[PDB]
Design a protein around this ligand. Sequence first.
Ligand code: HEM
Ligand SMILES: OC(Cn1cncn1)(Cn1cncn1)c1ccc(F)cc1F
Length: 528
Amino acid sequence: IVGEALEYVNIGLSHFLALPLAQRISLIIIIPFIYNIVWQLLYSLRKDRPPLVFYWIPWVGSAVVYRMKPYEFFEECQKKYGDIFSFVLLGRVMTVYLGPKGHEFVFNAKLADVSAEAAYAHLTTPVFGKGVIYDCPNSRLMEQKKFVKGALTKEAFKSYVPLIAEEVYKYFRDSKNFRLNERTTGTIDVMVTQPEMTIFTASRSLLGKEMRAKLDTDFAYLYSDLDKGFTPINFVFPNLPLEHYRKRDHAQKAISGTYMSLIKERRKNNDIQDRDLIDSLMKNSTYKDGVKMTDQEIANLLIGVLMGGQHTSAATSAWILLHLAERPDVQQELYEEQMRVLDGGKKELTYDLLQEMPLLNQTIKETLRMHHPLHSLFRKVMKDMHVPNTSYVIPAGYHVLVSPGYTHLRDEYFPNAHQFNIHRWNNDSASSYSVGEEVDYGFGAISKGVSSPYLPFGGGRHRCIGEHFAYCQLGVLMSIFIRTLKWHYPEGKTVPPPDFTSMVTLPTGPAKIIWEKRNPEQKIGGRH
Ligand code: HEM
Ligand SMILES: OC(Cn1cncn1)(Cn1cncn1)c1ccc(F)cc1F
Protein backbone atom coordinates (compact mmCIF):
# COMPACT_ATOMS: atom_id res chain seq x y z
CA ILE A 1 0.00 0.00 0.00
CA VAL A 2 1.62 3.19 -1.28
CA GLY A 3 -1.79 4.85 -0.96
CA GLU A 4 -0.79 5.77 2.58
CA ALA A 5 2.27 7.54 1.16
CA LEU A 6 0.26 10.01 -0.93
CA GLU A 7 -1.94 10.56 2.13
CA TYR A 8 1.12 11.67 4.11
CA VAL A 9 2.04 13.97 1.22
CA ASN A 10 -1.30 15.75 1.62
CA ILE A 11 -0.88 15.62 5.40
CA GLY A 12 2.62 17.08 5.17
CA LEU A 13 1.32 19.77 2.83
CA SER A 14 -1.29 20.89 5.37
CA HIS A 15 1.31 20.75 8.15
CA PHE A 16 3.57 23.00 6.06
CA LEU A 17 0.89 25.67 5.65
CA ALA A 18 0.35 25.54 9.43
CA LEU A 19 3.96 26.40 10.28
CA PRO A 20 4.51 29.68 12.18
CA LEU A 21 5.08 32.99 10.39
CA ALA A 22 8.69 32.73 11.56
CA GLN A 23 9.43 29.33 10.02
CA ARG A 24 7.33 29.82 6.88
CA ILE A 25 8.93 33.03 5.61
CA SER A 26 12.29 31.45 6.45
CA LEU A 27 11.43 28.60 4.07
CA ILE A 28 10.54 31.09 1.34
CA ILE A 29 14.17 32.15 1.83
CA ILE A 30 15.95 28.82 2.23
CA ILE A 31 14.06 26.73 -0.36
CA PRO A 32 15.08 28.98 -3.32
CA PHE A 33 18.57 29.35 -1.86
CA ILE A 34 18.93 25.56 -1.69
CA TYR A 35 17.35 25.00 -5.10
CA ASN A 36 19.64 27.69 -6.54
CA ILE A 37 22.72 25.70 -5.54
CA VAL A 38 21.17 22.45 -6.80
CA TRP A 39 20.31 23.86 -10.23
CA GLN A 40 23.85 25.16 -10.76
CA LEU A 41 25.47 21.80 -9.98
CA LEU A 42 23.09 20.16 -12.45
CA TYR A 43 23.87 22.95 -14.93
CA SER A 44 27.65 22.41 -14.83
CA LEU A 45 26.99 18.88 -16.12
CA ARG A 46 25.67 20.11 -19.47
CA LYS A 47 28.44 20.14 -22.07
CA ASP A 48 26.48 22.26 -24.57
CA ARG A 49 26.57 25.18 -22.11
CA PRO A 50 29.61 27.32 -21.29
CA PRO A 51 30.75 27.12 -17.66
CA LEU A 52 28.57 29.17 -15.32
CA VAL A 53 30.16 31.31 -12.61
CA PHE A 54 28.97 30.14 -9.21
CA TYR A 55 26.87 32.53 -7.12
CA TRP A 56 25.16 32.31 -3.73
CA ILE A 57 22.32 34.86 -3.97
CA PRO A 58 19.60 33.90 -6.49
CA TRP A 59 18.64 36.49 -9.13
CA VAL A 60 21.42 38.85 -7.98
CA GLY A 61 24.15 36.54 -9.25
CA SER A 62 27.65 37.96 -9.71
CA ALA A 63 26.23 41.49 -9.96
CA VAL A 64 28.27 42.93 -7.08
CA VAL A 65 31.75 42.03 -8.30
CA TYR A 66 30.89 42.63 -11.97
CA ARG A 67 29.56 46.10 -11.18
CA MET A 68 32.67 47.12 -9.22
CA LYS A 69 35.62 45.38 -10.95
CA PRO A 70 34.50 43.84 -14.25
CA TYR A 71 37.96 43.43 -15.79
CA GLU A 72 39.30 41.70 -12.69
CA PHE A 73 36.17 39.54 -12.63
CA PHE A 74 36.74 38.65 -16.29
CA GLU A 75 40.39 37.70 -15.79
CA GLU A 76 39.56 35.40 -12.88
CA CYS A 77 36.82 33.72 -14.90
CA GLN A 78 39.25 33.53 -17.82
CA LYS A 79 41.92 31.75 -15.76
CA LYS A 80 39.37 29.31 -14.34
CA TYR A 81 37.12 28.63 -17.34
CA GLY A 82 38.74 30.06 -20.47
CA ASP A 83 37.42 32.70 -22.83
CA ILE A 84 33.76 31.57 -22.86
CA PHE A 85 31.82 31.63 -19.58
CA SER A 86 28.42 32.68 -18.30
CA PHE A 87 27.34 34.49 -15.16
CA VAL A 88 24.01 35.58 -13.70
CA LEU A 89 23.38 39.33 -13.53
CA LEU A 90 20.26 40.73 -11.83
CA GLY A 91 17.95 38.12 -13.33
CA ARG A 92 19.77 37.81 -16.67
CA VAL A 93 22.22 35.19 -17.93
CA MET A 94 25.25 36.91 -19.48
CA THR A 95 27.49 34.82 -21.75
CA VAL A 96 30.91 36.47 -22.04
CA TYR A 97 33.19 35.70 -25.00
CA LEU A 98 36.60 37.25 -24.36
CA GLY A 99 39.19 38.03 -27.00
CA PRO A 100 39.21 38.80 -30.72
CA LYS A 101 37.02 35.78 -31.47
CA GLY A 102 34.57 37.10 -28.90
CA HIS A 103 34.52 40.35 -30.86
CA GLU A 104 33.62 38.39 -33.99
CA PHE A 105 30.97 36.28 -32.26
CA VAL A 106 29.07 39.30 -30.92
CA PHE A 107 29.85 42.34 -33.08
CA ASN A 108 29.44 40.29 -36.29
CA ALA A 109 26.51 38.18 -35.08
CA LYS A 110 23.61 37.67 -37.47
CA LEU A 111 20.82 40.24 -37.26
CA ALA A 112 18.43 37.34 -36.60
CA ASP A 113 20.62 35.91 -33.82
CA VAL A 114 21.06 38.92 -31.51
CA SER A 115 19.29 42.19 -30.73
CA ALA A 116 20.90 45.33 -29.36
CA GLU A 117 17.59 47.16 -28.92
CA ALA A 118 16.27 44.27 -26.83
CA ALA A 119 19.28 44.86 -24.55
CA TYR A 120 19.31 48.67 -24.46
CA ALA A 121 15.73 49.92 -25.03
CA HIS A 122 15.16 50.37 -21.30
CA LEU A 123 18.49 52.17 -20.81
CA THR A 124 17.99 54.77 -23.55
CA THR A 125 14.33 55.23 -24.55
CA PRO A 126 13.38 56.89 -21.21
CA VAL A 127 16.28 59.33 -21.67
CA PHE A 128 16.24 60.01 -25.41
CA GLY A 129 12.54 59.71 -26.25
CA LYS A 130 10.45 57.40 -28.36
CA GLY A 131 10.92 56.34 -31.96
CA VAL A 132 14.73 56.47 -32.28
CA ILE A 133 17.97 54.61 -31.52
CA TYR A 134 16.73 51.50 -29.70
CA ASP A 135 13.00 52.28 -29.80
CA CYS A 136 12.62 51.22 -33.45
CA PRO A 137 13.51 48.38 -35.85
CA ASN A 138 17.22 47.94 -36.54
CA SER A 139 16.64 49.03 -40.14
CA ARG A 140 15.37 52.36 -38.83
CA LEU A 141 18.47 52.68 -36.64
CA MET A 142 20.70 51.94 -39.64
CA GLU A 143 19.17 54.86 -41.54
CA GLN A 144 19.24 57.15 -38.50
CA LYS A 145 22.99 56.56 -38.32
CA LYS A 146 23.07 57.34 -42.05
CA PHE A 147 21.23 60.63 -41.42
CA VAL A 148 23.53 61.75 -38.59
CA LYS A 149 26.60 60.73 -40.60
CA GLY A 150 25.55 63.24 -43.28
CA ALA A 151 26.49 66.09 -40.93
CA LEU A 152 29.75 64.33 -40.02
CA THR A 153 31.74 65.01 -43.20
CA LYS A 154 35.21 66.46 -43.71
CA GLU A 155 33.56 69.69 -44.85
CA ALA A 156 31.58 69.82 -41.61
CA PHE A 157 34.73 69.14 -39.57
CA LYS A 158 36.53 72.01 -41.31
CA SER A 159 33.77 74.32 -40.07
CA TYR A 160 33.53 72.70 -36.63
CA VAL A 161 37.22 73.19 -35.81
CA PRO A 162 37.19 77.01 -35.50
CA LEU A 163 33.82 76.78 -33.72
CA ILE A 164 35.16 74.22 -31.24
CA ALA A 165 38.33 76.29 -30.88
CA GLU A 166 36.32 79.41 -30.01
CA GLU A 167 34.38 77.46 -27.36
CA VAL A 168 37.57 76.17 -25.72
CA TYR A 169 39.09 79.65 -25.58
CA LYS A 170 35.82 81.15 -24.31
CA TYR A 171 35.89 78.52 -21.56
CA PHE A 172 39.51 79.37 -20.69
CA ARG A 173 38.48 83.03 -20.50
CA ASP A 174 35.12 82.89 -18.70
CA SER A 175 34.94 79.71 -16.59
CA LYS A 176 35.69 80.02 -12.88
CA ASN A 177 37.88 76.93 -13.26
CA PHE A 178 40.36 78.94 -15.33
CA ARG A 179 39.91 82.69 -15.99
CA LEU A 180 43.23 82.86 -17.80
CA ASN A 181 43.10 86.66 -18.12
CA GLU A 182 43.07 86.90 -14.30
CA ARG A 183 44.91 83.77 -13.14
CA THR A 184 48.19 82.22 -14.28
CA THR A 185 47.73 79.03 -12.23
CA GLY A 186 44.94 77.09 -10.56
CA THR A 187 43.51 73.72 -9.58
CA ILE A 188 40.63 72.04 -11.42
CA ASP A 189 38.62 68.85 -11.10
CA VAL A 190 38.77 67.32 -14.57
CA MET A 191 35.40 65.66 -13.98
CA VAL A 192 33.99 69.18 -13.59
CA THR A 193 35.73 70.93 -16.48
CA GLN A 194 35.57 68.23 -19.16
CA PRO A 195 31.79 67.56 -19.11
CA GLU A 196 31.30 71.33 -19.37
CA MET A 197 33.82 71.78 -22.19
CA THR A 198 32.35 68.73 -23.92
CA ILE A 199 28.78 70.03 -23.93
CA PHE A 200 29.86 73.55 -24.90
CA THR A 201 31.87 72.36 -27.91
CA ALA A 202 29.40 69.65 -28.97
CA SER A 203 26.40 71.99 -28.74
CA ARG A 204 28.04 74.84 -30.66
CA SER A 205 29.11 72.60 -33.55
CA LEU A 206 26.41 69.92 -33.79
CA LEU A 207 23.37 71.86 -32.52
CA GLY A 208 24.22 75.43 -33.56
CA LYS A 209 24.59 78.77 -31.84
CA GLU A 210 20.96 78.98 -30.67
CA MET A 211 21.20 75.75 -28.68
CA ARG A 212 24.66 76.70 -27.42
CA ALA A 213 23.22 80.01 -26.20
CA LYS A 214 20.64 78.10 -24.13
CA LEU A 215 23.43 76.55 -22.03
CA ASP A 216 24.27 79.99 -20.61
CA THR A 217 20.84 80.12 -18.91
CA ASP A 218 18.72 78.18 -16.42
CA PHE A 219 18.04 75.78 -19.30
CA ALA A 220 21.40 74.11 -18.58
CA TYR A 221 19.81 72.64 -15.43
CA LEU A 222 17.61 70.47 -17.65
CA TYR A 223 20.67 68.93 -19.32
CA SER A 224 21.95 68.07 -15.84
CA ASP A 225 18.58 66.50 -14.99
CA LEU A 226 18.47 64.51 -18.23
CA ASP A 227 22.14 63.60 -17.82
CA LYS A 228 21.41 62.11 -14.39
CA GLY A 229 18.75 59.94 -16.03
CA PHE A 230 21.44 58.18 -18.09
CA THR A 231 22.46 55.64 -15.46
CA PRO A 232 22.74 51.84 -15.06
CA ILE A 233 19.74 51.72 -12.70
CA ASN A 234 17.49 51.99 -15.77
CA PHE A 235 18.49 48.39 -16.55
CA VAL A 236 16.53 47.38 -13.42
CA PHE A 237 14.29 50.35 -12.50
CA PRO A 238 13.48 52.27 -15.69
CA ASN A 239 10.54 54.09 -14.05
CA LEU A 240 9.86 54.56 -10.33
CA PRO A 241 7.70 57.15 -8.53
CA LEU A 242 10.64 59.40 -7.60
CA GLU A 243 11.88 62.94 -8.14
CA HIS A 244 14.85 61.71 -10.20
CA TYR A 245 12.58 60.10 -12.80
CA ARG A 246 10.29 63.15 -12.94
CA LYS A 247 12.98 65.76 -13.60
CA ARG A 248 14.42 63.35 -16.19
CA ASP A 249 11.16 62.96 -18.13
CA HIS A 250 10.50 66.69 -17.70
CA ALA A 251 13.97 67.43 -19.10
CA GLN A 252 13.40 65.13 -22.08
CA LYS A 253 10.13 66.89 -22.93
CA ALA A 254 11.58 70.34 -22.27
CA ILE A 255 14.81 69.78 -24.23
CA SER A 256 13.16 68.02 -27.17
CA GLY A 257 10.57 70.80 -27.15
CA THR A 258 13.32 73.40 -27.54
CA TYR A 259 14.79 71.45 -30.46
CA MET A 260 11.39 71.12 -32.15
CA SER A 261 10.78 74.83 -31.55
CA LEU A 262 13.95 75.65 -33.49
CA ILE A 263 13.18 73.03 -36.15
CA LYS A 264 9.63 74.26 -36.76
CA GLU A 265 10.91 77.85 -36.72
CA ARG A 266 13.61 77.28 -39.36
CA ARG A 267 11.16 75.56 -41.72
CA LYS A 268 8.72 78.40 -40.94
CA ASN A 269 11.31 80.78 -42.45
CA ASN A 270 13.15 78.47 -44.89
CA ASP A 271 16.17 79.18 -42.68
CA ILE A 272 17.44 75.69 -43.51
CA GLN A 273 21.10 75.73 -44.52
CA ASP A 274 24.22 73.64 -43.82
CA ARG A 275 25.27 74.95 -40.41
CA ASP A 276 24.67 72.09 -37.98
CA LEU A 277 23.18 68.64 -37.48
CA ILE A 278 19.76 70.28 -37.11
CA ASP A 279 19.81 71.69 -40.64
CA SER A 280 21.16 68.33 -41.83
CA LEU A 281 18.42 66.23 -40.24
CA MET A 282 15.77 68.68 -41.47
CA LYS A 283 16.94 68.16 -45.07
CA ASN A 284 17.82 64.48 -44.68
CA SER A 285 15.62 62.33 -42.44
CA THR A 286 13.39 60.36 -44.84
CA TYR A 287 13.61 56.57 -44.61
CA LYS A 288 13.85 54.51 -47.79
CA ASP A 289 10.20 53.42 -47.54
CA GLY A 290 9.20 57.09 -47.80
CA VAL A 291 8.34 57.65 -44.13
CA LYS A 292 9.74 60.93 -42.82
CA MET A 293 11.01 61.30 -39.27
CA THR A 294 8.74 63.52 -37.23
CA ASP A 295 10.08 66.66 -35.58
CA GLN A 296 9.80 64.78 -32.28
CA GLU A 297 11.86 61.85 -33.59
CA ILE A 298 14.47 64.21 -35.04
CA ALA A 299 14.74 66.01 -31.70
CA ASN A 300 14.97 62.70 -29.82
CA LEU A 301 17.75 61.53 -32.15
CA LEU A 302 19.58 64.77 -31.39
CA ILE A 303 19.35 64.07 -27.65
CA GLY A 304 20.61 60.50 -27.99
CA VAL A 305 23.51 61.37 -30.28
CA LEU A 306 24.56 64.38 -28.19
CA MET A 307 24.15 62.51 -24.89
CA GLY A 308 26.13 59.50 -26.07
CA GLY A 309 28.99 61.56 -27.44
CA GLN A 310 28.83 63.65 -24.27
CA HIS A 311 29.70 60.78 -21.91
CA THR A 312 32.28 59.03 -24.11
CA SER A 313 34.21 62.17 -25.05
CA ALA A 314 34.10 63.88 -21.64
CA ALA A 315 35.44 60.76 -19.95
CA THR A 316 38.15 60.46 -22.61
CA SER A 317 39.43 64.04 -22.40
CA ALA A 318 39.45 63.65 -18.62
CA TRP A 319 41.63 60.53 -18.94
CA ILE A 320 43.97 62.24 -21.42
CA LEU A 321 44.54 65.10 -18.98
CA LEU A 322 45.06 62.69 -16.08
CA HIS A 323 47.68 60.61 -17.90
CA LEU A 324 49.50 63.67 -19.22
CA ALA A 325 49.49 65.23 -15.74
CA GLU A 326 52.19 62.75 -14.68
CA ARG A 327 53.99 62.80 -18.06
CA PRO A 328 55.65 66.18 -18.61
CA ASP A 329 57.80 64.39 -21.19
CA VAL A 330 54.70 63.64 -23.26
CA GLN A 331 53.35 67.18 -22.80
CA GLN A 332 56.75 68.46 -23.95
CA GLU A 333 56.73 66.18 -27.00
CA LEU A 334 53.14 67.15 -27.84
CA TYR A 335 54.04 70.83 -27.54
CA GLU A 336 56.95 70.54 -30.00
CA GLU A 337 54.58 68.94 -32.51
CA GLN A 338 52.21 71.88 -32.02
CA MET A 339 55.00 74.39 -32.68
CA ARG A 340 56.18 72.49 -35.76
CA VAL A 341 52.77 71.91 -37.36
CA LEU A 342 51.32 75.33 -36.49
CA ASP A 343 54.53 77.25 -37.33
CA GLY A 344 55.23 78.36 -33.78
CA GLY A 345 51.58 79.23 -33.26
CA LYS A 346 51.37 81.57 -36.25
CA LYS A 347 49.10 79.17 -38.15
CA GLU A 348 45.45 78.89 -37.16
CA LEU A 349 44.33 75.37 -36.29
CA THR A 350 42.40 73.73 -39.13
CA TYR A 351 40.98 70.25 -39.65
CA ASP A 352 43.74 69.50 -42.17
CA LEU A 353 46.50 70.53 -39.74
CA LEU A 354 44.91 68.33 -37.05
CA GLN A 355 45.56 65.37 -39.36
CA GLU A 356 49.26 66.33 -39.43
CA MET A 357 49.53 65.87 -35.64
CA PRO A 358 50.21 62.13 -35.30
CA LEU A 359 51.48 62.28 -31.71
CA LEU A 360 48.35 64.16 -30.60
CA ASN A 361 46.13 61.60 -32.34
CA GLN A 362 48.23 58.75 -30.93
CA THR A 363 47.67 60.23 -27.46
CA ILE A 364 43.91 59.99 -28.01
CA LYS A 365 44.35 56.50 -29.46
CA GLU A 366 46.39 55.28 -26.48
CA THR A 367 43.97 56.80 -23.97
CA LEU A 368 41.10 55.01 -25.70
CA ARG A 369 43.14 51.81 -25.43
CA MET A 370 43.64 52.02 -21.67
CA HIS A 371 40.22 53.59 -21.01
CA HIS A 372 37.52 52.18 -23.24
CA PRO A 373 34.52 54.17 -21.95
CA LEU A 374 32.16 51.21 -22.45
CA HIS A 375 33.73 48.25 -20.65
CA SER A 376 30.95 45.89 -21.78
CA LEU A 377 28.54 45.77 -24.70
CA PHE A 378 25.39 43.63 -24.67
CA ARG A 379 23.06 41.86 -27.07
CA LYS A 380 20.04 39.72 -26.23
CA VAL A 381 20.19 36.30 -27.90
CA MET A 382 17.10 35.89 -30.08
CA LYS A 383 17.79 32.46 -31.61
CA ASP A 384 19.88 29.61 -30.22
CA MET A 385 23.50 30.25 -31.22
CA HIS A 386 26.26 27.69 -31.72
CA VAL A 387 29.82 28.74 -30.86
CA PRO A 388 32.17 27.61 -33.68
CA ASN A 389 34.84 25.04 -32.81
CA THR A 390 32.96 24.22 -29.59
CA SER A 391 29.94 22.20 -28.55
CA TYR A 392 28.53 25.25 -26.75
CA VAL A 393 25.04 26.53 -27.53
CA ILE A 394 23.82 29.89 -26.23
CA PRO A 395 20.03 29.46 -25.92
CA ALA A 396 17.68 32.29 -26.79
CA GLY A 397 16.89 34.44 -23.77
CA TYR A 398 20.54 34.61 -22.78
CA HIS A 399 22.56 37.78 -23.30
CA VAL A 400 26.00 37.92 -24.92
CA LEU A 401 28.63 40.31 -23.57
CA VAL A 402 31.61 41.51 -25.61
CA SER A 403 34.41 43.51 -23.98
CA PRO A 404 37.10 44.87 -26.31
CA GLY A 405 38.24 47.17 -23.50
CA TYR A 406 39.38 44.04 -21.68
CA THR A 407 41.48 42.90 -24.65
CA HIS A 408 42.95 46.42 -24.82
CA LEU A 409 44.63 45.67 -21.48
CA ARG A 410 46.03 42.20 -22.24
CA ASP A 411 49.81 41.96 -22.56
CA GLU A 412 49.48 39.33 -25.31
CA TYR A 413 48.01 41.91 -27.70
CA PHE A 414 49.54 45.10 -26.27
CA PRO A 415 52.94 44.56 -24.62
CA ASN A 416 53.07 46.27 -21.22
CA ALA A 417 49.36 46.96 -21.56
CA HIS A 418 49.09 48.89 -18.29
CA GLN A 419 51.80 51.35 -19.39
CA PHE A 420 50.64 54.56 -21.08
CA ASN A 421 52.78 54.80 -24.24
CA ILE A 422 51.63 56.85 -27.23
CA HIS A 423 54.66 55.59 -29.17
CA ARG A 424 53.22 52.08 -29.46
CA TRP A 425 51.16 53.74 -32.23
CA ASN A 426 54.14 55.15 -34.15
CA ASN A 427 53.29 55.11 -37.87
CA ASP A 428 49.74 54.15 -36.87
CA SER A 429 47.95 57.28 -35.61
CA ALA A 430 44.67 56.55 -37.43
CA SER A 431 41.65 56.51 -35.11
CA SER A 432 41.03 53.00 -36.53
CA TYR A 433 41.21 51.45 -39.96
CA SER A 434 39.83 48.44 -41.81
CA VAL A 435 42.55 45.82 -42.15
CA GLY A 436 40.89 44.57 -45.35
CA GLU A 437 37.40 43.97 -46.77
CA GLU A 438 34.31 46.06 -46.07
CA VAL A 439 30.51 45.90 -45.76
CA ASP A 440 27.74 48.52 -45.72
CA TYR A 441 24.86 47.98 -43.28
CA GLY A 442 23.05 51.14 -44.39
CA PHE A 443 25.28 53.92 -43.04
CA GLY A 444 28.40 53.51 -45.17
CA ALA A 445 31.16 51.02 -45.84
CA ILE A 446 32.85 49.76 -42.67
CA SER A 447 35.27 46.95 -41.87
CA LYS A 448 33.85 43.49 -42.53
CA GLY A 449 36.16 41.80 -40.06
CA VAL A 450 35.89 42.70 -36.38
CA SER A 451 38.87 40.64 -35.18
CA SER A 452 41.17 43.54 -34.27
CA PRO A 453 42.19 43.45 -30.58
CA TYR A 454 41.75 47.25 -30.66
CA LEU A 455 38.04 48.13 -31.01
CA PRO A 456 37.42 51.44 -29.23
CA PHE A 457 34.41 52.14 -31.49
CA GLY A 458 33.04 48.61 -31.75
CA GLY A 459 32.25 46.98 -35.06
CA GLY A 460 29.49 45.52 -37.15
CA ARG A 461 26.07 47.05 -37.66
CA HIS A 462 26.15 48.85 -34.30
CA ARG A 463 29.60 50.38 -34.89
CA CYS A 464 30.14 53.97 -33.79
CA ILE A 465 29.66 56.82 -36.26
CA GLY A 466 31.01 59.59 -34.01
CA GLU A 467 34.63 58.41 -34.21
CA HIS A 468 35.76 61.21 -36.52
CA PHE A 469 33.78 63.83 -34.61
CA ALA A 470 35.25 62.68 -31.29
CA TYR A 471 38.80 62.88 -32.65
CA CYS A 472 38.03 66.31 -34.09
CA GLN A 473 36.57 67.50 -30.78
CA LEU A 474 39.27 65.87 -28.63
CA GLY A 475 41.95 67.00 -31.08
CA VAL A 476 41.02 70.69 -31.10
CA LEU A 477 40.59 70.63 -27.32
CA MET A 478 43.91 68.92 -26.62
CA SER A 479 45.75 71.05 -29.19
CA ILE A 480 44.65 74.16 -27.28
CA PHE A 481 45.31 72.66 -23.84
CA ILE A 482 48.85 71.73 -24.91
CA ARG A 483 49.69 75.11 -26.43
CA THR A 484 48.15 77.08 -23.54
CA LEU A 485 48.98 75.19 -20.35
CA LYS A 486 51.26 72.85 -18.50
CA TRP A 487 49.70 70.75 -15.77
CA HIS A 488 50.64 68.26 -13.07
CA TYR A 489 49.23 66.43 -10.07
CA PRO A 490 49.03 67.70 -6.50
CA GLU A 491 51.90 66.15 -4.57
CA GLY A 492 51.39 62.43 -3.97
CA LYS A 493 48.44 62.15 -6.37
CA THR A 494 48.46 59.96 -9.48
CA VAL A 495 46.09 58.56 -12.12
CA PRO A 496 42.86 57.54 -10.35
CA PRO A 497 41.31 54.10 -10.86
CA PRO A 498 38.29 53.87 -13.18
CA ASP A 499 34.74 54.04 -11.86
CA PHE A 500 33.19 51.05 -13.63
CA THR A 501 29.80 51.58 -11.94
CA SER A 502 28.71 54.64 -13.94
CA MET A 503 27.39 54.68 -17.51
CA VAL A 504 30.96 55.09 -18.80
CA THR A 505 34.25 54.13 -17.15
CA LEU A 506 35.04 57.68 -16.06
CA PRO A 507 37.83 58.33 -13.54
CA THR A 508 37.08 58.14 -9.83
CA GLY A 509 36.63 61.72 -8.68
CA PRO A 510 37.66 64.13 -7.52
CA ALA A 511 40.52 63.90 -10.04
CA LYS A 512 42.37 67.19 -9.59
CA ILE A 513 45.21 68.64 -11.65
CA ILE A 514 47.14 71.90 -11.29
CA TRP A 515 47.37 73.98 -14.46
CA GLU A 516 49.71 76.88 -15.15
CA LYS A 517 49.92 79.16 -18.17
CA ARG A 518 52.83 78.64 -20.55
CA ASN A 519 52.48 82.37 -21.30
CA PRO A 520 51.36 84.18 -18.11
CA GLU A 521 50.85 87.40 -20.11
CA GLN A 522 48.73 85.82 -22.86
CA LYS A 523 45.24 87.34 -22.93
CA ILE A 524 42.11 86.00 -24.63
CA GLY A 525 40.14 88.59 -26.55
CA GLY A 526 36.41 89.10 -26.89
CA ARG A 527 33.82 90.70 -24.64
CA HIS A 528 32.35 89.29 -21.44
C1 HEM B 1 35.69 58.61 -27.58
C2 HEM B 1 34.47 58.70 -28.12
C3 HEM B 1 33.55 57.49 -28.45
C4 HEM B 1 33.73 56.17 -28.29
C5 HEM B 1 34.96 55.44 -27.70
C6 HEM B 1 32.55 55.48 -28.77
C7 HEM B 1 32.33 54.12 -28.78
C8 HEM B 1 31.24 53.48 -29.34
C9 HEM B 1 31.02 52.05 -29.37
C10 HEM B 1 31.97 50.98 -28.78
C11 HEM B 1 29.86 51.81 -29.99
C12 HEM B 1 29.25 50.42 -30.24
C13 HEM B 1 28.11 50.18 -29.26
C14 HEM B 1 27.61 48.76 -29.41
O1 HEM B 1 28.14 48.03 -30.28
O2 HEM B 1 26.68 48.37 -28.65
C15 HEM B 1 29.29 53.09 -30.38
C16 HEM B 1 28.10 53.27 -31.05
C17 HEM B 1 27.57 54.48 -31.46
N1 HEM B 1 28.09 55.73 -31.16
FE1 HEM B 1 29.93 56.10 -30.27
N2 HEM B 1 31.66 56.43 -29.22
C18 HEM B 1 32.24 57.67 -29.04
C19 HEM B 1 31.67 58.88 -29.37
C20 HEM B 1 30.52 59.07 -30.10
C21 HEM B 1 30.08 60.33 -30.67
C22 HEM B 1 30.89 61.64 -30.51
C23 HEM B 1 28.92 60.11 -31.30
C24 HEM B 1 28.02 61.11 -32.09
C25 HEM B 1 28.36 62.37 -32.38
C26 HEM B 1 28.59 58.70 -31.16
C27 HEM B 1 27.48 58.06 -31.66
C28 HEM B 1 27.28 56.69 -31.74
C29 HEM B 1 26.21 56.01 -32.43
C30 HEM B 1 25.07 56.69 -33.23
C31 HEM B 1 26.37 54.68 -32.26
C32 HEM B 1 25.44 53.60 -32.86
C33 HEM B 1 24.90 52.62 -31.82
C34 HEM B 1 24.18 51.48 -32.49
O3 HEM B 1 24.12 51.46 -33.75
O4 HEM B 1 23.67 50.59 -31.77
N3 HEM B 1 29.59 58.10 -30.42
N4 HEM B 1 30.17 54.08 -29.97
O1 LIG C 1 26.22 52.91 -27.15
C1 LIG C 1 25.64 53.98 -26.40
C2 LIG C 1 24.72 53.34 -25.33
N1 LIG C 1 25.46 52.55 -24.36
C3 LIG C 1 25.87 51.29 -24.44
N2 LIG C 1 26.50 50.93 -23.34
C4 LIG C 1 26.43 52.05 -22.60
N3 LIG C 1 25.82 53.07 -23.16
C5 LIG C 1 26.80 54.76 -25.75
N4 LIG C 1 27.65 55.41 -26.74
C6 LIG C 1 28.54 54.88 -27.56
N5 LIG C 1 29.09 55.80 -28.32
C7 LIG C 1 28.46 56.92 -27.90
N6 LIG C 1 27.58 56.75 -26.94
C8 LIG C 1 24.86 54.91 -27.34
C9 LIG C 1 24.84 54.67 -28.70
C10 LIG C 1 24.20 55.52 -29.58
C11 LIG C 1 23.58 56.63 -29.08
F1 LIG C 1 22.96 57.48 -29.94
C12 LIG C 1 23.56 56.92 -27.74
C13 LIG C 1 24.20 56.05 -26.90
F2 LIG C 1 24.18 56.31 -25.57
